[model samples]
Target: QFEERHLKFLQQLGKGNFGSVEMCRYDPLQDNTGEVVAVKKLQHSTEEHLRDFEREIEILKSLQHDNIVKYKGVCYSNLKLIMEYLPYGSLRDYLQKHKERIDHIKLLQYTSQICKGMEYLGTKRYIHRDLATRNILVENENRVKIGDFGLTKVLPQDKEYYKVKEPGESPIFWYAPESLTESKFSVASDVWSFGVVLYELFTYIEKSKSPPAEFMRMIGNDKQGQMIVFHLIELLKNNGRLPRPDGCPDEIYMIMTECWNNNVNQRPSFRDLALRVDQIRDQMAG
Candidate 1:
């Protein structure tokens, strides 16, 4: 039987749209020395959300890899879940926190780690529709584990891509042009998002601090605020251009450009990308 007493909650980590996560001590066997973990509990969950959460848990349970977040278990009673506690938090937040001081070597290391995770997902025929630095978690030893598999889709046999009539709401900035325009998702499109992730790593600066309501407030009379955002999105979709990040090595920038290619077929597979990043690391170290 699943019970709240099985786990002891310590501090709230962070909240999302569906629920809030907390740092907890899990001692399912009644031992005092239990594992430190994160427990996510659903809030105001609807039937659809319940199904999605159940499906995400199933996907996570089936996946086991060093670069993937370990799923401990789930409590059916209160809709609570136990997962490996990553103290370092999301990679995006980490980079933002250390933007000025993050060196190229460290950036390459993190990039390779993210690629390893993506490569594993690719082999498993899983399409991580939401692959971003924010979805990547950092653990001890500065290791990365791919997390937030909520929007993932499993590819069927004999198919290289999955077609979606409605792709749902996604982060516009990180989405590939094809994904936004054609609702097409595949390993290739994931490679596209992976490229954007690299761009985020290279840039490292926080994009904007204003909340969503702030944009609405700026849209009072002329609606110029809304138009400005739309214009930027159009530009990104068409030109696939962003301000080049300073201090980025030419080799790394080359990889970013390839990934952002207008043709989805032009992006290299994660496996190839990982090998290239590893080679760069070796050259730097040697």
Candidate 2:
């Protein structure tokens, strides 16, 4: 049982239909060894959301890694919940707070840490359907702690072999072309998102006062989202080119294009993505 004093709610961190996350402090046992943790209470949840939340809790509890968020415990009576408090907050928030004076190489390194976390998650056969800056957390400056497994799902290895690769709309601006038509999302899909995360790591200077409502709505829909996503893909294809970030090497651009490829088999895995990033990091660091 969690008590009011046993848990000191630091502040209202984030919220959605599922519930809100709060940075809290609590004592595990009677030893008075208090620790800070993030607590989320289930509220305004629908059956579908509840199922997703339950699935996330299951994955979070089962997952054990330095890069992944650790589930200290849960509070299920008053409301369904699984919590792990982080003192450093999310990568999204951290980036927002310190947008200025951030080192490009370190940001890349941080993204690499996220890749490590993704690699760890891949070992469990759990595909984090949503891998973005918001889902990645920063426990410290050098280490990134992965969180929010709400969209995670375990896919069979056999299914992975036959997975279709088509562009699909990502939750944020990170989606590639093949994810939509293929109906198959794999580690490569995560790689595409990682590229976008890497893009955000390097860029994202001016905070858009508001979210991209049109893009958000289009991606939020079912069939229409895919259609809208295809339009963006078509635009890129019709133009016969991608913006291809300036100063980004040909190899990096090649990876990005392959990641957005219409054929899933052509796309590389998260491990491959990590390797590529490592190569780039080595080149840049050296």
Candidate 3:
């Protein structure tokens, strides 16, 4: 039973279409000493959907992993959540701002960390439908963690894929072929998103905008919806691929291509991706 008395609201962290995440001070002992935590608050939610969310948090609460932003507890009174607040915020900002300062091996290690966290999610039968560098958080220690995976959902007991029931404004750029063409989300699709994020990490992200914007300029595709995604589908089917980022190892870019495999069954698992990335990162160390 978390009482509002022990909690002190602080400045907001970030806001999106879903809702706002506010930084909060929690006093477990109900004393002056408090711990700072990030609280994600959702709006436009009904009790029916809220209970499902509560259940999802129940499962996520028991989950503890190093490369993930730890969810501490839930504030049921308000459909918000409490989690550790890493000060560096999203990796998208950090990678771009420090592009000149962050060297090669460090860049390799950044995506290496993400692969490990993703493997954890895979084993738990969870899929972060919208995995991107923008959705991940970082710290001063040069380590990054997957965060704000609000699009995350646990795969059902009966099957592997979780079809979209009410898809919101989808990140069309980050989506895989299966997701883009069939509206099917699975571990493979999640891996495709990882490849996109990994590419973002090794590229001139500052010069580039979101994937669609970057791709749109490449072919002069219209910015309007329906038109953009329709073109993207044709582009993929026509065998188009994002070019390798300069300074990125050829071996690394190959991995990205593998993730984008048109054959969903051929995509590598996060477990294998973590192992592969770890080995490459180790070799880059010297």
Candidate 4:
């Protein structure tokens, strides 16, 4: 358990829909040491936000993968969680800011890391409903950490998917076909998001890219969220898939396409994805 007295808030890191992360100095650890960590504080204390905050902590506690953000502990009284602090921020921003510094090979390495974490999640029957670059944090130039558990769900002992039928909609840009239509999210759906994330890495400099502009352009300046989702659903159904991002290798493009397979069973498993990325990285390194 994290003690409130030991945590000293230094500065705000980022604020979002549910919480604000701050850089905090943790002192007097078990051995009377000190270290810097990020503290995620519940942004709101409403009943609705409280429940989601509680669920996020529960999910964070269960995850311990290297590519996934490490959860240290939580201070229930303060509604705060202590976690590993990575200064580079989200993979989305990291790529854009240091686009030229990260080459194709390093980009592939980052994808492989995300897959490694996803592979571990698959084994644990956990579905990261919001798997995307924006939710992923970069540990350094060579490593990344999957952070945020806002929309994660755990599959039951015998269940294949979790139908998140409730308030609030998903981030359509990174969602799968079934996710927008049937409102169901499973391993396959999460895999689909991985493909979009790979697309982001490839098209790091282009904004409002992918999810096919054929649909995105049609979105009016003032648009309803539901309409945007519906329009995308139709476009995807018609096979309006993303084209090869310029400079992306043909082989890698095909792998990205495999992630967006409409047929759920056809999508590659995270286990397969992990190996596929590792093998490709090895082949390209030579």
Candidate 5:
């Protein structure tokens, strides 16, 4: 059982919607050294809200895969969670810093790891409604793990779509066309967001922003804001493609197109994606 006495708070790491994350060291006693961990404290939670938070914690605890973040345990007194501390921070920030220098092979390897993680989730019936670069975390060695399970939804074995019950803000640029249009979420929609993540790996643009700066400026005119961008992208879908990032390999671009297919049924499964990426890695090695 984890207790307040066991943790020594260090510094603030980051903040989330519900709470702030703190860097901490685990030591039940002051006489011994401690293990580093991240502590996320959920503040101002009501009974109902805490239930949701606890449920999220349970989900995190249940997930056991190399490409998924490790959940240490919870500190019930303040609704704080102890989790694995990744020194390299988010994959989004990491890619943003190194986008110009990151090679094609390494980029494919990272995306393949992401697919492996998502494949594990798919087998477990969990759909990460938001799958983007920001939700992916990295270690100092460049190992990637899919994190932030806050928006995850679990579907029954027989169900295809999990319809949104509430109209809430969604990631406009990362969303699949059907998800954006019909407010439905599924593994297929996640695959669409995965394509967007690949675009991020290559382009490093700000979230929901397109590649061309001039296009973004012209589109951001409130009279011609995101709605137009979305509409334009939808229109472009008829041609069966999104704008390919500059320098994107034909093979990688093909994978992105498969993930972004307008017909959800046509998209490749994460397992298939992993295999394709593995083949790419093998080819590169040879």
Candidate 6:
């Protein structure tokens, strides 16, 4: 039950594949304090799915943080679940408007915040299967809250949950080597996706690059694909490969390269990545 007696719908904010999000305001001075909040009402779900949805709600509600999206509460009216609304929208849309135009300090800060959030999720034995800039929202310039963790899964803390899936099913570009062949996904796999996000950040600084012939030579290996991206961008006649921007230090170049290693085990943990970025940021800040 909502605590506020006078909360009312303000306007629709966003629509997802299975739900619609709305903006709502409560009278702060009166009862709930007229603070603004966003809510998402999921489409009518079957009775069977309702239990599962509630489970998801329970899981989400337990996740509380300034960087991770907050789960205020849910409503059961007309077979729909209302979720918290995020006002800033998605990072993908934000980037579309800004392009590769964000400065090094800004981009570094934004991506570092993402690493911190990811590190927290990893420590909780949770793997955000789908991690993209689009999934991260700017709570404020100094920090970002991760959202839309629909694809997330909780790994067993005892280490018995290392089962693999059949090959060719997981996301190719984002999937780790073990996942592509065995179907077993781990925190490492999630780290791989985090690396992709870093690559995206790099793309803005470096500029556009094409797929090199080398990619064709090693078809299907994600690591090769990444290296090829660098080569292609460099080989191009015009704006070939995006160079690591002037502001990002050389260490970042090495960090990005390690993330794209042919061996999945070689990739750094989310915690290590965060710490590295923090070190980089301090150096930059000073």
Candidate 5 residue runs with Cα over 4 Å from true position: 205-220, 223-242
> Which scores greater on TM-score, model 5 or model 6?
5
Regions of candidate 3 where Cα sits further than 4 Å from its true position? 27-32, 48-52, 207-209
For all the candidates, what are their Cα RMSDs to the real structure? 3.9, 5.0, 2.2, 2.5, 2.9, 6.8
Superior candidate under lDDT, 1 versus 6 = 1
Residue-level lDDT of model 6, residues 125-244, one tens digit each, is 777666776667766546667876555667877872356433222344455555545556777877767766776666552223212222333332354644644433333313222235
- The local lDDT score (0 to 100) that residue 135 gets in candidate 2 is 79
Q: TM-scores of all models?
A: 0.86, 0.78, 0.91, 0.92, 0.88, 0.73
- Best-to-worst ranking by lDDT: 4, 3, 5, 1, 2, 6
- Of candidate 2, the 10-residue stretch with the lowest lDDT total is 205-214
Give the clash count for each candidate. Answer: 0, 11, 0, 0, 0, 20
Q: What overall lDDT goes with each candidate model? A: 0.77, 0.65, 0.79, 0.83, 0.78, 0.61
Off by over 4 Å in 1: 27-32, 208-233
The true-versus-predicted C-alpha distance at residue 153 of model 3, in Å, is: 2.2
User: Per-residue alpha-carbon lDDT of model 4 for 1-286, expressed as tens digits?
Assistant: 6678888778988875578899988886644467899999876787887888878888888988899999988886747878999989998888888875789899999999999998888888888888878889999888998888877888988789988878475677778999889888899999999988888889874676645453477554355666887777887887777777888988889888998888889999888888888999898999
> What lDDT score goes with residue 142 in model 6?
60
- Model 2 spans > 4 angstroms off: 1-5, 27-33, 78-82, 161-172, 208-227, 236-255
Q: What does the lDDT read for residue 34 in candidate 6?
A: 69
User: What are the per-residue Cα lDDT tens digits for candidate 2 across 1-286?
Assistant: 5554477666777873356788776865646677777787767567766776777778898988888988876665444454666667778778878874666677767866787889988887877767777778787888888787765668886776225333223463554445544445677777767666665554443343212333344334343543665655654345333345445456666665666655546767778777877888898887
Best by TM-score: 4
User: Lowest summed-lDDT stretch of 10 residues in model 3?
Assistant: 48-57
What overall lDDT, based on C-alpha atoms, would model 6 receive against the true structure?
Answer: 0.61
Q: Model 5: how far is 96 from its true place, Å?
A: 1.8
Q: Residue by residue across 1-286, what tens digits does model 5's lDDT show?
A: 5788778888887765455778888887676687889888777677865765776788789899999999998887648778999988888888878766778778888989999999998887888887888788997555899988766778867888887767445666677777767777899989888987887787765545453342344445443544765754555467534567777788988888888788889999999999999998898888
